[PDB]
Design a protein around this ligand. Structure first.
Ligand code: MG
Ligand code: MG
Ligand code: MG
Ligand code: MG
Ligand code: MG
Ligand code: MG
Ligand code: MG
Ligand code: MG
Ligand code: MG
Ligand code: MG
Ligand code: MG
Ligand code: MG
Ligand code: MG
Ligand code: MG
Ligand code: MG
Ligand code: MG
Ligand code: MG
Ligand code: MG
Ligand code: MG
Ligand code: MG
Ligand code: MG
Ligand code: MG
Ligand code: MG
Ligand code: MG
Ligand code: MG
Ligand code: MG
Ligand code: MG
Ligand code: MG
Ligand code: MG
Ligand code: MG
Ligand code: MG
Ligand code: MG
Ligand code: MG
Ligand code: MG
Ligand code: MG
Ligand code: MG
Ligand code: MG
Ligand code: MG
Ligand code: MG
Ligand code: MG
Ligand code: MG
Ligand code: MG
Ligand code: MG
Ligand code: MG
Ligand code: MG
Ligand code: MG
Ligand code: MG
Ligand code: MG
Ligand code: MG
Ligand code: MG
Ligand code: MG
Ligand code: MG
Ligand code: MG
Ligand code: MG
Ligand code: MG
Ligand code: MG
Ligand code: MG
Ligand code: MG
Ligand code: MG
Ligand code: MG
Ligand code: MG
Ligand code: MG
Ligand code: MG
Ligand code: MG
Ligand code: MG
Ligand code: MG
Ligand code: MG
Ligand code: MG
Ligand code: MG
Ligand code: MG
Ligand code: MG
Ligand code: MG
Ligand code: MG
Ligand code: MG
Ligand code: MG
Ligand code: MG
Ligand code: MG
Ligand code: MG
Ligand code: MG
Ligand code: MG
Ligand code: MG
Ligand code: MG
Ligand code: MG
Ligand code: MG
Ligand code: MG
Ligand code: MG
Ligand code: MG
Ligand code: MG
Ligand code: MG
Ligand code: MG
Ligand code: MG
Ligand code: MG
Ligand code: MG
Ligand code: MG
Ligand code: MG
Ligand code: MG
Ligand code: MG
Ligand code: MG
Ligand code: MG
Ligand code: MG
Ligand code: MG
Ligand code: MG
Ligand code: MG
Ligand code: MG
Ligand code: MG
Ligand code: MG
Ligand code: MG
Ligand code: MG
Ligand code: MG
Ligand code: MG
Ligand code: MG
Ligand code: MG
Ligand code: MG
Ligand code: MG
Ligand code: MG
Ligand code: MG
Ligand code: MG
Ligand code: MG
Ligand code: MG
Ligand code: MG
Ligand code: MG
Ligand code: MG
Ligand code: MG
Lengths: 125, 100, 48, 50, 115, 110, 154
RNA sequence: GGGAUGACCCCAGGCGGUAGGGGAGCGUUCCCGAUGCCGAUGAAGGCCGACCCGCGAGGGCGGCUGGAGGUAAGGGAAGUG
RNA sequence: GGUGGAGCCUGGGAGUGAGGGCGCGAGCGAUAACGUCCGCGUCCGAGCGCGGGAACAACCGAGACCGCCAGCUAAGGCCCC
RNA sequence: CCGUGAGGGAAAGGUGAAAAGAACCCCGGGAGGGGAGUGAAAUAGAGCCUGAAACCGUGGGCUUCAAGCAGUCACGGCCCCGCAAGGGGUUGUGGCGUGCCUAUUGAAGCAUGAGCCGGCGACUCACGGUCGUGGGCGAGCUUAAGCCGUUGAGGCGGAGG
């Protein structure tokens, strides 16, 4: 008895608000949605997962002292080329990318992981 | 109308007129087989305790096969240890006739 | 001193090297007086 | 009797040890001599009776 | 009598190179790279045979857990259900049910919550 | 109907002459004739001689209508190589391979 | 390597050439070098015990007689041995050349007459041996030479 | 245990492995078998194969090439992988 | 008590006589060393085969005859990867 | 051929039964080829039996914003063979994955060896010993050299051990 495996599904679309939902708690959910692990025909190699839209980023909240104290880093190729950007300065200059980065870091790595990330469109407001 | 039966420590989903390959069982080719009393129906209320008593699946022994040979090789580096063994695993073929 | 290649280069990596080595056919124009083919801005082999 | 069925007894030929052919087949690579040392070396050891 | 190599080694080498058909570059053309590649291919097959079983179960579970989460419960409680209700059917392979036969699966959710 | 010429043991290096054969493949005999004339390589002299022997083969042996010829197929294989000593510094002596081509033009009618 | 034709000269210096290390080209690792443990002339013979050869002869006639393939005879009327003459007597004997025959007699004329038959091997009496008894389907002697076959055993 | 006194059926166990010990086998050259047998309606050798037998080493069988040899069952000997 | 790939006796064949980590007990060292030297255990060696420890001979789990798209567990885990 | 010399010291065999070894014509300066002819066979055409592998090439099918000891397990796509649930090819994505040998306490190891392919390449023989084993005869066993015979025939020979 072979195991069931779909033919091409049509991709669902989904909308989330994210104001006041915290950050990684919300990110968890976008991740399993993007992957498609809520659908009971989940397959690891295909990418049958809901396109996720998110409005009202920049209104994610977060606990502790992370707004001053949580730093994002970027290394260029060059000597001295490590950039250190704290959470507040990010939201002020690029709110989302803060949710995008939280989710990108939670999807799998590889070509399929990189495609699912394309299926997440994050807006502010 | 389907069922879910158990032969050979495995559980397959039978419908009438479906040929399926099964861990070998002792029965002449053409002889008839009352498959241990299955665990689900496709009009569905019938689930219960491990096995539903009374209802069976009857399938006819088409014949006894030997699957395609599998090469089982073992190698351990820097120890001069290699083993080669061919294994093809016996099976019996069945056709699902009726759900009783 | 005396550098040296560290691995025999595979067939794919040398043929990939050669992805640029192909020729381009000579660029030719019909001759106004004669019938034949001539490279432009040069004097016609037949009928100078 | 005939020459086809002449055939010695089930003991009696036994047909010997080819050391140093493949792995697996036991005797192999090192010809049942272990690793290095005078006893492994070709002219080997020094007359162990004395 | 002298018994020179003759034909034995060419056949042995051909035997291997047939198995190595398809392998990249020299691993399919050179008897030595052929054999070295095979060694690995043999332990990999034996290992991934052992872990096709694991790999397939893991897939059934994510699907079971997905469907019955639509019916508001865990996977882990769901299994406690059937352990209690004596329903050692599911043989997680038959999350076949969860996809093809939803209301047969549904009947098993409700069979399960009754603990 | 097809007509072939083969120049065997041409004292030139395959990789070199293979380059101009690549230039005229699937081309009508008329453009191929124009291309080898104005292609500046030693190897066009030879490819040309084979074209021409093959064209003549098309006409005087196979009834093929010269004005319909194209180079259906062509390829240069590598014949046996002439090995010559090359004396180097400090008594050293390498061997250069003066190599060798089997040029082959194959014609059809289009 | 000792008996091959080449010199004892060391082929290269042994260090700093960048090549493997070698002695004389006689060495068995070299193509055209000497052999290692190849055959030399040797004598495959050995003295099998006399009682074992004695018994084995008796035992081998026995196996023939046990099958009724042994026959003893007299005088053939086939002397002045020409093979056509022998071929006649062998027909009164029931030997139609359908089974290989071993013929033991000290009568040169009769041996000479049978020799060339594909199906006959011939043999003086004092030359009886198990090997020939066993390859021939039938055994045929005369009454001399069965005399000596008897006086040889025991 | 089965009483076929077995060559196999049933039951229960054991079966990671280097140095190393033991045991069974495969294949290569040559000998007896062979004044035989296979062979031009095609030997050996080569190239294929998703086919059959074998745990495996291997053996078959088919097709293609090849064009004059090859060698059973059973045993013997080695320049035997 | 304990029938065990237990034990003892005779004989054929060995290989080994560079060990290492860890725990516990000491000496040497500096209540240093992935140090060194002994003791009793263990594992790697030869289990660089499997699960856990991100990765990792020897720490935790566990001694891999073969096959299965069946089940229960061990250590470790159950927010996403 | 190397060496002043003593001296060192190779490679290198095969058309076909028969030269019947391809007149003649065509392209070409020749080489070489294309027809023609010979032959059972001409990818037996003389760079000649068979004609493996590495290596090089032409043509076709599948295949290309990912990261790797190159495979393996799964599924899916395309191509092929078939009556069929079938099988062969290829590889998109996903899971997994530290080359072989050697030497080592320990190697993917940034420790040895190996460019790749083919072929050559290493546990023997004699005579003793010492065990085991298959047989023979057994208070006995057994012959050596030689002699006779045979020319793939065996016998005799008792010194001796
Ligand atoms: Mg390894
Ligand atoms: Mg090791
Ligand atoms: Mg090994
Ligand atoms: Mg030995
Ligand atoms: Mg070995
Ligand atoms: Mg051994
Ligand atoms: Mg061993
Ligand atoms: Mg030993
Ligand atoms: Mg030793
Ligand atoms: Mg030894
Ligand atoms: Mg060694
Ligand atoms: Mg040592
Ligand atoms: Mg030693
Ligand atoms: Mg010793
Ligand atoms: Mg010595
Ligand atoms: Mg020596
Ligand atoms: Mg040889
Ligand atoms: Mg050899
Ligand atoms: Mg050899
Ligand atoms: Mg498991
Ligand atoms: Mg110079
Ligand atoms: Mg000079
Ligand atoms: Mg070179
Ligand atoms: Mg000498
Ligand atoms: Mg000499
Ligand atoms: Mg000499
Ligand atoms: Mg000297
Ligand atoms: Mg060097
Ligand atoms: Mg030589
Ligand atoms: Mg020689
Ligand atoms: Mg005869
Ligand atoms: Mg068992
Ligand atoms: Mg074992
Ligand atoms: Mg044993
Ligand atoms: Mg052994
Ligand atoms: Mg020979
Ligand atoms: Mg012969
Ligand atoms: Mg015949
Ligand atoms: Mg004929
Ligand atoms: Mg026939
Ligand atoms: Mg044929
Ligand atoms: Mg032969
Ligand atoms: Mg053959
Ligand atoms: Mg053949
Ligand atoms: Mg075969
Ligand atoms: Mg055939
Ligand atoms: Mg065949
Ligand atoms: Mg053939
Ligand atoms: Mg033919
Ligand atoms: Mg001939
Ligand atoms: Mg043969
Ligand atoms: Mg034979
Ligand atoms: Mg034979
Ligand atoms: Mg035989
Ligand atoms: Mg034999
Ligand atoms: Mg040898
Ligand atoms: Mg034991
Ligand atoms: Mg023991
Ligand atoms: Mg013991
Ligand atoms: Mg003992
Ligand atoms: Mg021994
Ligand atoms: Mg001992
Ligand atoms: Mg030994
Ligand atoms: Mg010892
Ligand atoms: Mg000892
Ligand atoms: Mg010591
Ligand atoms: Mg030490
Ligand atoms: Mg020490
Ligand atoms: Mg230790
Ligand atoms: Mg120890
Ligand atoms: Mg110690
Ligand atoms: Mg403690
Ligand atoms: Mg230490
Ligand atoms: Mg310490
Ligand atoms: Mg220790
Ligand atoms: Mg060691
Ligand atoms: Mg161990
Ligand atoms: Mg252990
Ligand atoms: Mg471990
Ligand atoms: Mg490792
Ligand atoms: Mg581990
Ligand atoms: Mg781990
Ligand atoms: Mg076990
Ligand atoms: Mg076990
Ligand atoms: Mg626990
Ligand atoms: Mg000179
Ligand atoms: Mg001179
Ligand atoms: Mg001839
Ligand atoms: Mg000839
Ligand atoms: Mg001749
Ligand atoms: Mg001139
Ligand atoms: Mg003709
Ligand atoms: Mg013919
Ligand atoms: Mg041919
Ligand atoms: Mg031929
Ligand atoms: Mg040639
Ligand atoms: Mg011939
Ligand atoms: Mg011939
Ligand atoms: Mg040829
Ligand atoms: Mg191509
Ligand atoms: Mg792409
Ligand atoms: Mg992969
Ligand atoms: Mg090595
Ligand atoms: Mg070493
Ligand atoms: Mg070393
Ligand atoms: Mg060392
Ligand atoms: Mg060391
Ligand atoms: Mg070291
Ligand atoms: Mg490296
Ligand atoms: Mg080392
Ligand atoms: Mg070094
Ligand atoms: Mg290395
Ligand atoms: Mg080494
Ligand atoms: Mg060394
Ligand atoms: Mg080398
Ligand atoms: Mg080499
Ligand atoms: Mg080599
Ligand atoms: Mg080689
Ligand atoms: Mg030895
Ligand atoms: Mg020996
Ligand atoms: Mg001896
Ligand atoms: Mg002895
Ligand atoms: Mg003895």
């Amino acid at each position: 008895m072979k195991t069931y495996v779909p033919k091409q599904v049509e991709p669902r679309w989904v909308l989330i608000d994210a104001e006041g939902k915290t950050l990684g708690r919300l990110a968890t959910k976008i991740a399993t949605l993007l992957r498609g692990k809520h659908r009971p025909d989940w397959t690891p190699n295909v990418a049958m997962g809901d396109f996720v839209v998110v409005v009202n980023a920049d209104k994610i909240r977060v606990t502790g002292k992370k707004l001053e104290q949580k730093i994002y880093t970027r290394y260029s190729g060059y000597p001295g080329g490590l950039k250190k950007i704290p959470l507040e300065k990010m939201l002020a200059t690029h709110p989302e990318r803060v949710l995008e980065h939280a989710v990108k870091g939670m999807l799998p790595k590889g070509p399929l992981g990189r495609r699912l990330f394309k299926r997440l469109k994050v807006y502010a407001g | 109308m389907f069922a879910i039966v158990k032969t050979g420590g495995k559980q397959y989903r039978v419908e009438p007129g479906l040929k399926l390959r099964v861990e070998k069982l002792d029965a002449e080719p053409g002889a008839t087989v009352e498959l241990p009393v299955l665990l689900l129906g496709g009009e569905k209320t019938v689930v219960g305790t491990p096995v539903v008593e009374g209802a069976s699946v009857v399938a006819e022994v088409l014949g006894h096969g030997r699957g395609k040979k599998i090469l089982v090789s073992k190698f351990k580096a820097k120890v001069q240890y290699r083993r080669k063994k061919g294994h093809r695993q016996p099976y019996t073929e069945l056709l699902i006739k009726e759900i009783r | 001193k005396h550098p040296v290649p560290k691995k025999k280069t595979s067939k794919a990596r040398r043929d990939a090297r050669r992805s640029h080595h192909a020729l381009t056919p000579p660029t030719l124009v019909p001759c106004p007086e004669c019938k034949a083919m001539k490279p432009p801005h040069t004097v016609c082999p037949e009928c100078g | 009797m005939k020459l086809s069925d002449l055939r010695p007894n089930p003991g009696a030929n036994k047909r010997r040890k080819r050391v140093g052919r493949g792995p697996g087949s036991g005797h192999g690579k090192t010809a049942t001599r272990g690793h290095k040392g005078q006893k492994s070396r070709s002219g080997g050891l020094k007359d162990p009776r004395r | 009598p002298r018994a020179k190599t003759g034909v034995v080694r060419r056949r042995k080498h051909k035997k291997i190179l047939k198995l190595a058909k398809g392998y990249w570059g020299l691993r399919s053309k050179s008897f030595r790279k052929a054999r070295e590649t095979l060694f690995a291919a043999g332990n990999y097959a034996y290992a991934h045979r052992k872990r096709r079983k694991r790999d397939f179960r893991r897939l059934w579970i994510v699907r079971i857990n997905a469907a019955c989460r639509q019916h508001g419960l865990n996977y882990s409680t769901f299994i406690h259900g059937l352990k209690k209700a004596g329903i050692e059917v599911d043989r997680k392979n038959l999350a076949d049910l969860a996809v093809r036969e939803p209301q047969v699966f549904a009947e098993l959710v409700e069979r399960a919550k009754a603990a | 109907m097809e007509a072939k010429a083969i120049a065997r043991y041409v004292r030139i290096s395959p990789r070199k002459v293979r380059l101009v054969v690549d230039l005229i493949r699937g081309k009508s005999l008329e453009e191929a004739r124009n291309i080898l004339r104005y292609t500046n390589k030693r190897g066009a002299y030879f490819v040309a001689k084979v074209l021409e022997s093959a064209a003549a083969n098309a006409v005087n042996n196979h009834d093929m209508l010269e004005d319909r010829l194209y180079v259906k197929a062509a390829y240069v294989d590598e014949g046996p190589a002439l090995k010559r000593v090359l004396p180097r510094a400090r008594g050293r002596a390498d061997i250069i391979k003066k190599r060798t081509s089997h040029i082959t033009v194959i014609l059809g009618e289009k | 390597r000792g008996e091959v034709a080449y010199s004892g000269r060391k082929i290269w210096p042994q260090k700093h050439t960048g090549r493997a290390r070698h002695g004389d080209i006689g060495a068995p690792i070299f193509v055209g070098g000497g052999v290692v443990f190849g055959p030399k002339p040797r004598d495959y013979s050995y003295t099998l015990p006399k009682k074992v050869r004695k018994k084995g002869l008796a035992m081998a006639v026995a196996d023939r007689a046990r099958e009724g393939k042994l026959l003893l005879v007299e005088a053939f009327a086939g002397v002045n041995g020409k093979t056509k003459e022998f071929l006649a007597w062998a027909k009164e004997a029931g030997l139609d050349g359908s089974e290989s025959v071993l013929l033991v007699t000290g009568n040169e004329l009769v041996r000479r007459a049978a020799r060339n038959l594909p199906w006959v091997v011939t043999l003086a009496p004092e030359g009886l041996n198990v090997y020939d008894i066993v390859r021939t389907e039938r055994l045929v002697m005369d009454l001399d030479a069965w005399e000596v076959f008897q006086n040889r055993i025991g």
